[PDB]
Write a protein that binds this ligand. Structure first.
Ligand code: HEM
Length: 396
């Protein structure tokens, strides 16, 4: 009954055997070691305990299992992490995010306008994937005419930061970083010359304790915002909508009562957990929930496993938009708790509301399909999602 798994193999997260493996871990070895000896916290309690002990469970070795740390806030410990976060968080105040509703809602209606006359689309390719990229592109000063070029960068940049870059990909990947770097430094220079109220303008002016973000830091932190908030948000939108359609009583409940939308978004986040893991590196030997851990090794925090922990969530394989409490760990916990969580929730809220209203009879093309998942060991979710609906006229 024990799973024979490599937690650094993206195929594990795409196999649809992962939650069965998680169940074995939570029941039998809550701090699990995989077939290569990699440690992983599988229970909600173990994930929370590690998050609450950043001096023992550090981010400064990097958040990926077999990669060096990068000079960005997520690979830093406090108090230096706080300064970097304080500087960047000026772009993500509650007002600034709330003020994005008008533009985000307009993006949602434009995306739905593009497919509403067809009566079919791919929910991932045509709705869930374009929205987070357009939202982040808008904040970074990407013209809609530059969205094609910017979109190729964003896909190739995921490969750049991934665990293995093939010989055949090395060129396009370093070319994507260079292109992103050059583009971003141009935007930075433009806002230092002529400030506006976009994200880069806010970041170039941000000052904490007489310290500002350097140009190097601005490229790194905007890159973290782009990669961190693009595919993740996409996967919650698609996988959450998949669950509304597979449990159509939940779709009907939400369609009938807009006040259920916040709870629905939280259940979509709990269920989809697009960030499958973040690593911590041990700063000392320790005994952790029955497993001996050694100084210098990394442990994965399995957020999806935690989100299906029966110790915290009653009937966790039931998708329930009215679930309360719903203290899921899709955004993590503690000092690195997702900086983009309010923006992600707003994108998800606005798009889901518009889909339920404008594609009211949305359905999966084939409910017996096992839809394909991205075989990546870090962020994963649906690769495609064919849907059908009654055509309607665009709002234009
Ligand atoms: C549904 C979408 C999202 C998910 C599931 C998600 C998930 C996460 C997770 C799990 C972490 C690490 C927390 C931890 O280790 O405890 C994180 C950190 C972060 N996320 Fe997100 N995220 C999402 C959307 C976004 C967006 C839209 C942004 C854009 C600003 C963003 C920017 C960040 C940043 C900058 C960090 C690093 C925070 C820090 O180190 O202090 N994320 N996110």
């Amino acid at each position: 009954i024990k799973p024979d798994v490599d937690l650094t193999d993206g195929n594990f997260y795409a196999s649809r055997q992962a939650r069965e493996a998680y169940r074995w871990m939570r029941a039998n070895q809550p701090v699990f070691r995989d077939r290569n000896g990699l440690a992983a916290a599988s229970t909600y309690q173990a994930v929370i305990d590690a998050e609450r002990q950043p001096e023992l469970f550090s981010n400064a070795g990097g958040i990926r299992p077999d990669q060096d740390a990068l000079p960005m806030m997520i690979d830093m410990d406090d108090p230096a992490h706080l300064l970097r976060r304080k500087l960047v968080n000026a772009g993500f105040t509650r007002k600034r995010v709330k003020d994005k509703e008008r533009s985000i809602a307009q993006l949602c209606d434009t995306l739905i306008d593009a497919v509403c006359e067809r009566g079919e689309c791919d929910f991932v390719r045509d709705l869930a994937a374009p929205l987070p990229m357009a939202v982040i592109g808008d904040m970074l000063g990407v013209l809609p005419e530059q969205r094609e070029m910017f979109l190729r960068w964003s896909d190739d940049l995921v490969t750049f930061l991934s665990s293995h870059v093939s010989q055949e990909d090395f060129q396009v990947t370093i070319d994507a970083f260079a292109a992103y770097n050059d583009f971003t430094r141009a935007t930075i220079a433009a806002r230092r010359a002529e400030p506006t109220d976009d994200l880069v303008s806010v970041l170039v002016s941000s000052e904490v304790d007489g310290e500002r973000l350097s140009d190097d830091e601005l490229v790194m932190e905007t890159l973290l915002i782009l990669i961190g908030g693009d595919e993740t948000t996409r996967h919650t939108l698609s996988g959450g909508s998949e669950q509304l359609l597979r449990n159509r009583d939940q779709w009907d409940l939400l369609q009938s009562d807009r006040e259920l939308l916040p709870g629905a978004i939280e259940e979509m986040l709990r269920w989809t957990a697009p960030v499958k893991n973040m690593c911590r590196m041990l700063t000392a030997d320790t005994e952790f929930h029955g497993t001996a851990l050694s100084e210098g090794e990394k442990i994965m925090l399995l957020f999806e496993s935690a989100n299906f922990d029966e110790a915290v969530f009653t009937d966790p394989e039931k998708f329930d938009i009215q679930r309360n409490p719903n203290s899921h760990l899709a955004f993590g916990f503690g000092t690195h708790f997702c900086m983009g969580n309010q923006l992600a929730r707003l994108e998800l809220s606005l798009m889901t509301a518009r889909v339920v209203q404008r594609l009211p009879d949305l359905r999966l093309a084939d409910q017996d399909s096992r839809l394909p998942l991205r075989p990546a060991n870090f962020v994963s979710g649906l690769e495609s999602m064919p849907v059908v609906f009654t055509p309607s006229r665009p709002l234009s």
